[PDB]
Amino acid sequence: VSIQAFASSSTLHGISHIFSYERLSLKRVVWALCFMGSLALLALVCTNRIQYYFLYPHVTKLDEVAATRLTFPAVTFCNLNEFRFSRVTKNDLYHAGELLALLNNRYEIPDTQTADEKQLEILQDKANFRNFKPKPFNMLEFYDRAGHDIREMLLSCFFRGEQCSPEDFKVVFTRYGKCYTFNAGQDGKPRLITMKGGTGNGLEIMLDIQQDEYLPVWGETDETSFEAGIKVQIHSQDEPPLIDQLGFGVAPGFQTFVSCQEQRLIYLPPPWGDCKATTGDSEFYDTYSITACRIDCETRYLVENCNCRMVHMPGDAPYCTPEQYKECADPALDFLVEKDNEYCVCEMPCNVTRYGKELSMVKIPSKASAKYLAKKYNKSEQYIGENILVLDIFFEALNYETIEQKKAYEVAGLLGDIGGQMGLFIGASILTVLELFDYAYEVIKH
Amino acid sequence: VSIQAFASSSTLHGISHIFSYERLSLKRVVWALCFMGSLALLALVCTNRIQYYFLYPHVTKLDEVAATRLTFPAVTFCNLNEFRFSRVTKNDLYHAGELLALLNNRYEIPDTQTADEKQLEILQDKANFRNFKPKPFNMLEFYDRAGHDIREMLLSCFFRGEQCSPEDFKVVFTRYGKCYTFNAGQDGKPRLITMKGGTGNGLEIMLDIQQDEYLPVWGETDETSFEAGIKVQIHSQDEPPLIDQLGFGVAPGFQTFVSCQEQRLIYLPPPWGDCKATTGDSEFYDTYSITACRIDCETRYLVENCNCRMVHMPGDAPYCTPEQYKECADPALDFLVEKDNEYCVCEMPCNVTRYGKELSMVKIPSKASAKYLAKKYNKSEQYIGENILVLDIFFEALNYETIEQKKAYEVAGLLGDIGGQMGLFIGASILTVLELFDYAYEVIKH
Amino acid sequence: VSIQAFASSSTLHGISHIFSYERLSLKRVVWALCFMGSLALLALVCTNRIQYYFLYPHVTKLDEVAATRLTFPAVTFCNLNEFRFSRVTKNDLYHAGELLALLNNRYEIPDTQTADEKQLEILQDKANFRNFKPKPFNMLEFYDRAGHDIREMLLSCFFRGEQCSPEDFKVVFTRYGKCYTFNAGQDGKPRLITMKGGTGNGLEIMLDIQQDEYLPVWGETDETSFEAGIKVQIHSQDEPPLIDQLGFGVAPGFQTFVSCQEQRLIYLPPPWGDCKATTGDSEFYDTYSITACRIDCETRYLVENCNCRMVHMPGDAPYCTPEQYKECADPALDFLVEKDNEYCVCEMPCNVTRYGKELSMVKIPSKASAKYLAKKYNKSEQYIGENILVLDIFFEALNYETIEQKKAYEVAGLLGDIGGQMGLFIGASILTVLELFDYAYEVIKH
Ligand SMILES: *[C@@H]1O[C@H](CO)[C@@H](O)[C@H](O)[C@H]1NC(C)=O
Ligand SMILES: *[C@@H]1O[C@H](CO)[C@@H](O)[C@H](O)[C@H]1NC(C)=O
Ligand SMILES: *[C@@H]1O[C@H](CO)[C@@H](O)[C@H](O)[C@H]1NC(C)=O
Ligand SMILES: *[C@@H]1O[C@H](CO)[C@@H](O)[C@H](O)[C@H]1NC(C)=O
Ligand SMILES: *[C@@H]1O[C@H](CO)[C@@H](O)[C@H](O)[C@H]1NC(C)=O
Ligand SMILES: *[C@@H]1O[C@H](CO)[C@@H](O)[C@H](O)[C@H]1NC(C)=O
């Protein structure tokens, strides 16, 4: 009933000395200030732990090991030329001549041409449209036919001692045209694995970029460039290539060693981080990713503005006219990748695989082996230094790395902190504060 | 009063069974050893948590995301030649001839010269000092005038589809001479941003290193080297370039793709780590950094030893004579960057921005576009393969990374551990040990 | 005795209101459900912390600083040729001619040879075995003698301003043959240190790959390749080189800048991670490592299958015949590094040092310094662009990095969580549950 009788039986550690059955003394002012000193200091450290919880903190866990049974990625490579010079016919020069800067606006050879005594004559008799009635023309058939063929570029391929074939590369269409992907993982083919590190457990491709098949550059367009070589992108199996933006280049006349390292990044869902479902809802792909978020940007943009998609874009929209490349599709796509700040926002998925790589080159051929490669492939010694290219893609020793975001402070650790801090200063529980509310309920009713 | 009366009311969980109102039995020896067993085991786990706190531990938090509105850094590039050959006059050869290894100690052409039939004759009639009365000469005017000009090297520049100009590069003086910085961020110009990854949201510079303007190398000095190309440093806006030590090189005749990734590093102050104030007190710079700590090393050293500063050093000290470069300033600066172990210690700041990069090259020009660039810039086809250089600097998809050091164990988590460990073994609080001191104060007074 | 008398004195916070000396009311059903509600909710958060402990979790600690007194690593480089052409004698061509694809199976020059009018005549009069009685022949003497000599390749070497010598490189035998290691750390030589970052605190080697000494390639073997240059491996002092698998290449005619960063990786022993003792038991090396685990794989494999070891393999097994290279040792070693999935498993050590590097190249020579290097080394201007090679290996500013795995949840933090969670919900200790077992022991005996 009385406060002296309640504080004797209660489970607060300090109140029994404050409300004892004695007179007022030096003790009752030094027990009360130690109790109110411990009650106020409890509120500072419990506010510190509750406000730390609702920030939802998280730390990282970076394992970097030498894993086995590691899946070899997909390697997409594109020749920097888009079309072979000997495959461009008279019908192809009629429709896509102004796009390739080979004709004027009046279907004739420009006066500012840069060609020798031979390639000018080959272009002058197939740009003769005296009795030319035009035939129909599609761009997808023209990238497929006039592009570079893998049965002529691929001189040798070895993956882990086993010889490749030109039927091991899958034809993919990018902005560079007819491109090829090793270890695409599609068409029912199983995926290839690597066990250890080094050049022996990797890919080795010897190519031929065929500079004699390059069509002459007479202007600055989006289909003719000033360079020679290939561009390579090493990406995951479930990710489409974005090789015009995210690819590295390989020069002819060199053997390029590409030492990779697979880095898997795992994030947290809200309220700790950001996660869209990685096997979520992309419009034309099964696995959501950053590059799959950017391709259906570009597909939705070009269909909205000029009613057509390019040949490297999915969907059922019609392909663009060769005039609609020059007028609509090239400046609208150049607006997205360069000057656009607002149209594309992409939510981060929480399975992102990154391949960090280190490139190095030696010179091919030496003076000793120059005459052997000229006879082996029926070529000249001037051809070999200009065109032959070897690419080595492999993993290092520490080939696997995981960067995982993990929760730093959970609800079971929150109750362990605020249960020890309640017990340290006053020694109470949640059944103590219900015993305080029981005496508060008794003092109102009487 | 009695110990049996005190232990009945006290809040230690074990002492009431030890001092009960009974005879000695098997219980009083098994309650006391469980209490002294829990009292001694409390001291082992509370010592483990207090000694863990005063080590001041910390863990890391590595976020690696694809950020937007990301600020494009500053790009400083220097041609590997210091002076153009057609800008060196007769007065310049008189004073700085022995420095450039073009004259002997008696102001005449050395007998061990390596020049052809034309560049030797051009040097023989401007090294004729028969009636030459010398004029005054400053080195800062000679790096500024005889250095390479950006209105002749810069053939084209594009940043995110927008064309650059030669007025977009800021003249900075380094040890290589007259150098240029894109996106310097100074002079009231706002800083440029990038949104996405890829080559379209980056910089593209086509240069001309001008090997016909290289002055001939006749010896091994600190101003003439054996190489050709440029050196580039990609640094932050608030950081001076140290391009002679920390720059990467770019070769002529190639298109170099530089795929970067911004990495921001945040550390902890003492007693957890090391922090000088990043906007602290550097002698000639506002933001403290590692390179700003090294330049005022080199400025304070050369003024102390030989009373002059070089042209790339701040302050109000006089510039060095061309003899004081050869005698004082070059071996004293070569002592600091190479053989010095004691003069410079730099406290680590805790905002360090690092740009990790991956380089790749294709060949420029191809055989198709060689004749077009020769006519476009009024040059020869031999000139284009030797001198033309294209540089692409861009960000990848995962372009942003934060490595932040965070405290692993604080004072609110320390009281939650030692408050639960006191409560687990004996069930006490800090008001329990004041109840023990109250009975100790009563037993002395009576 | 009674349950009302026991619950009044006990230290469970809720049981005294359940078993009071009153009648049944609304309170006895609301004290019991709050006690059994707090008793059941205690079991959910204590199971969450005990099951979290026995997963043995761990987080990481990534420090990335600019350390001083940092030890410079070992640099192993191998020329891509194995044997000099002018050192192959008539006895050497008799035994190891078919291995080098210079002879048929009947000891004569093949009809499909690729050589000019001079190197064919030099091979035709030393492949004349008309009166040739054969002499004995060992392969270790043939890699040592006919390999490339460092007193002819090394044109200059500087480490931190101090000039190297050819006696500073240690001869190591790899699969490429006679190879050399700078800063090997053996033979009583102290290890070299670096203080700051930049090219001045690093190594600078000017080489001569000697393409006039390359023996002609007439086929595809494991000792003759199509390339020219060197391969370099930057490894630790206590680690053998694996340069045929884990080395990067450097091309002639370029100055390669290699900007490194030392990364030290520390793991945890079981049950938290995986540790073999790093100074454990390798069969032929003192410090256990990944590459030392792979070399005694390859040594144990070849001795088991074809009774001999190659010249780059330790032990006391006999060296292989030049026929046993072609028949046994080359396809058995090509099976291990390429197609083997089961023979080698290597337990991870927990001191792994990794050197992450960034390569960049400028062109050597320029047109100005081409005639000087031709006269300095008594060579032609055609020789200098094909053969001269400069390599710069240095550290960056943030040259040191530590990735340490640290335990996230220990036994002293487990008792602090489950001691606060016991105290928060019921306010009990381990001396409370012994007071419950004391009343359970009393109710059985009476
Ligand atoms: C994401 O990765 C984790 C671990 O690699 C895996 O368990 C999970 O299934 C993945 N989610 C996907 C692929 O949607
Ligand atoms: C080899 O090349 C020549 C010239 O290109 C060609 O005429 C010939 O058909 C090719 N093939 C063979 C087997 O000679
Ligand atoms: C350091 O960085 C943090 C976060 O980037 C920022 O809040 C702080 O103002 C910076 N300190 C400086 C620039 O002195
Ligand atoms: C082009 O180059 C030549 C030779 O270098 C020069 O004489 C001429 O003035 C230049 N300009 C034009 C417009 O021809
Ligand atoms: C492993 O590294 C740690 C820290 O670098 C060191 O203390 C320990 O002695 C090392 N163990 C070895 C070399 O066996
Ligand atoms: C220089 O080279 C030539 C031709 O290789 C040689 O005959 C001569 O001995 C070499 N040395 C000197 C000092 O001329």
Side-chain angles (χ1 to χ4, degrees), chain C residues 264 266 277-280 287 350-351 400:
Chain C
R264 185 175 293 172
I266 300 168
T278 64
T279 62
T287 300
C350 43
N351 274 329
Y400 184 73

PDB file of all heavy atoms in Angstrom, chain C residues 264 266 277-280 287 350-351 400, ligand 5:
ATOM      1  N   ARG C 264      48.215  -7.430 -49.115  1.00  0.00           N
ATOM      2  CA  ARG C 264      48.442  -8.547 -48.211  1.00  0.00           C
ATOM      3  C   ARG C 264      47.106  -9.071 -47.713  1.00  0.00           C
ATOM      4  O   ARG C 264      46.269  -8.300 -47.236  1.00  0.00           O
ATOM      5  CB  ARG C 264      49.320  -8.130 -47.035  1.00  0.00           C
ATOM      6  CG  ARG C 264      49.686  -9.278 -46.123  1.00  0.00           C
ATOM      7  CD  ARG C 264      50.647  -8.833 -45.046  1.00  0.00           C
ATOM      8  NE  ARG C 264      51.942  -8.460 -45.605  1.00  0.00           N
ATOM      9  CZ  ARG C 264      52.917  -7.892 -44.908  1.00  0.00           C
ATOM     10  NH1 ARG C 264      52.750  -7.632 -43.619  1.00  0.00           N
ATOM     11  NH2 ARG C 264      54.063  -7.585 -45.498  1.00  0.00           N
ATOM     12  N   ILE C 266      45.070 -11.803 -45.288  1.00  0.00           N
ATOM     13  CA  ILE C 266      45.183 -12.607 -44.077  1.00  0.00           C
ATOM     14  C   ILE C 266      43.837 -13.272 -43.834  1.00  0.00           C
ATOM     15  O   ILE C 266      42.807 -12.593 -43.795  1.00  0.00           O
ATOM     16  CB  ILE C 266      45.594 -11.755 -42.868  1.00  0.00           C
ATOM     17  CG1 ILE C 266      46.945 -11.093 -43.117  1.00  0.00           C
ATOM     18  CG2 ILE C 266      45.670 -12.605 -41.622  1.00  0.00           C
ATOM     19  CD1 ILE C 266      47.283 -10.025 -42.117  1.00  0.00           C
ATOM     20  N   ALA C 277      49.509 -24.070 -42.379  1.00  0.00           N
ATOM     21  CA  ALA C 277      50.623 -23.280 -41.868  1.00  0.00           C
ATOM     22  C   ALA C 277      51.481 -22.790 -43.027  1.00  0.00           C
ATOM     23  O   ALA C 277      51.943 -23.592 -43.847  1.00  0.00           O
ATOM     24  CB  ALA C 277      51.455 -24.105 -40.889  1.00  0.00           C
ATOM     25  N   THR C 278      51.662 -21.467 -43.110  1.00  0.00           N
ATOM     26  CA  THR C 278      52.375 -20.874 -44.239  1.00  0.00           C
ATOM     27  C   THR C 278      53.853 -21.235 -44.208  1.00  0.00           C
ATOM     28  O   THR C 278      54.466 -21.452 -45.259  1.00  0.00           O
ATOM     29  CB  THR C 278      52.197 -19.357 -44.237  1.00  0.00           C
ATOM     30  OG1 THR C 278      52.795 -18.809 -43.059  1.00  0.00           O
ATOM     31  CG2 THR C 278      50.720 -19.003 -44.251  1.00  0.00           C
ATOM     32  N   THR C 279      54.443 -21.306 -43.020  1.00  0.00           N
ATOM     33  CA  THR C 279      55.754 -21.927 -42.853  1.00  0.00           C
ATOM     34  C   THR C 279      55.606 -23.397 -42.474  1.00  0.00           C
ATOM     35  O   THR C 279      56.185 -23.877 -41.500  1.00  0.00           O
ATOM     36  CB  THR C 279      56.567 -21.170 -41.812  1.00  0.00           C
ATOM     37  OG1 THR C 279      55.896 -21.225 -40.546  1.00  0.00           O
ATOM     38  CG2 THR C 279      56.736 -19.717 -42.227  1.00  0.00           C
ATOM     39  N   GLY C 280      54.817 -24.123 -43.261  1.00  0.00           N
ATOM     40  CA  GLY C 280      54.497 -25.502 -42.959  1.00  0.00           C
ATOM     41  C   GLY C 280      55.435 -26.491 -43.612  1.00  0.00           C
ATOM     42  O   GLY C 280      56.658 -26.348 -43.525  1.00  0.00           O
ATOM     43  N   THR C 287      58.596 -22.008 -47.186  1.00  0.00           N
ATOM     44  CA  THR C 287      57.310 -21.347 -47.023  1.00  0.00           C
ATOM     45  C   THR C 287      56.290 -21.992 -47.952  1.00  0.00           C
ATOM     46  O   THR C 287      56.506 -22.058 -49.167  1.00  0.00           O
ATOM     47  CB  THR C 287      57.431 -19.852 -47.314  1.00  0.00           C
ATOM     48  OG1 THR C 287      58.370 -19.264 -46.406  1.00  0.00           O
ATOM     49  CG2 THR C 287      56.086 -19.166 -47.154  1.00  0.00           C
ATOM     50  N   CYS C 350      47.187 -18.715 -45.176  1.00  0.00           N
ATOM     51  CA  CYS C 350      46.674 -17.439 -44.694  1.00  0.00           C
ATOM     52  C   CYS C 350      47.775 -16.419 -44.448  1.00  0.00           C
ATOM     53  O   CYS C 350      47.784 -15.717 -43.438  1.00  0.00           O
ATOM     54  CB  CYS C 350      45.793 -17.626 -43.464  1.00  0.00           C
ATOM     55  SG  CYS C 350      46.317 -18.760 -42.192  1.00  0.00           S
ATOM     56  N   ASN C 351      48.717 -16.349 -45.384  1.00  0.00           N
ATOM     57  CA  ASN C 351      49.465 -15.128 -45.697  1.00  0.00           C
ATOM     58  C   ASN C 351      49.733 -15.172 -47.201  1.00  0.00           C
ATOM     59  O   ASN C 351      50.668 -15.829 -47.661  1.00  0.00           O
ATOM     60  CB  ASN C 351      50.753 -14.964 -44.906  1.00  0.00           C
ATOM     61  CG  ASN C 351      50.532 -14.303 -43.572  1.00  0.00           C
ATOM     62  OD1 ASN C 351      49.628 -13.485 -43.423  1.00  0.00           O
ATOM     63  ND2 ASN C 351      51.391 -14.626 -42.600  1.00  0.00           N
ATOM     64  N   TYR C 400      50.186   0.238 -50.349  1.00  0.00           N
ATOM     65  CA  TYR C 400      50.032  -0.872 -49.424  1.00  0.00           C
ATOM     66  C   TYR C 400      48.563  -1.063 -49.081  1.00  0.00           C
ATOM     67  O   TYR C 400      47.820  -0.096 -48.900  1.00  0.00           O
ATOM     68  CB  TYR C 400      50.856  -0.634 -48.154  1.00  0.00           C
ATOM     69  CG  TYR C 400      50.833  -1.772 -47.169  1.00  0.00           C
ATOM     70  CD1 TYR C 400      51.520  -2.948 -47.426  1.00  0.00           C
ATOM     71  CD2 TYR C 400      50.149  -1.658 -45.969  1.00  0.00           C
ATOM     72  CE1 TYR C 400      51.509  -3.990 -46.525  1.00  0.00           C
ATOM     73  CE2 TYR C 400      50.135  -2.691 -45.061  1.00  0.00           C
ATOM     74  CZ  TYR C 400      50.815  -3.855 -45.345  1.00  0.00           C
ATOM     75  OH  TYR C 400      50.801  -4.889 -44.442  1.00  0.00           O
TER      76      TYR C 400
HETATM   77  C1  LIG D   5      51.364 -14.069 -41.260  1.00  0.00           C
HETATM   78  O1  LIG D   5      51.229 -12.624 -41.262  1.00  0.00           O
HETATM   79  C2  LIG D   5      51.129 -12.038 -39.953  1.00  0.00           C
HETATM   80  C3  LIG D   5      50.906 -10.561 -40.155  1.00  0.00           C
HETATM   81  O2  LIG D   5      51.497 -10.121 -41.368  1.00  0.00           O
HETATM   82  C4  LIG D   5      52.386 -12.352 -39.145  1.00  0.00           C
HETATM   83  O3  LIG D   5      52.250 -11.825 -37.828  1.00  0.00           O
HETATM   84  C5  LIG D   5      52.610 -13.858 -39.092  1.00  0.00           C
HETATM   85  O4  LIG D   5      53.845 -14.133 -38.440  1.00  0.00           O
HETATM   86  C6  LIG D   5      52.627 -14.464 -40.503  1.00  0.00           C
HETATM   87  N1  LIG D   5      52.769 -15.912 -40.439  1.00  0.00           N
HETATM   88  C7  LIG D   5      53.728 -16.606 -41.070  1.00  0.00           C
HETATM   89  C8  LIG D   5      54.698 -15.817 -41.898  1.00  0.00           C
HETATM   90  O5  LIG D   5      53.803 -17.828 -40.974  1.00  0.00           O
END
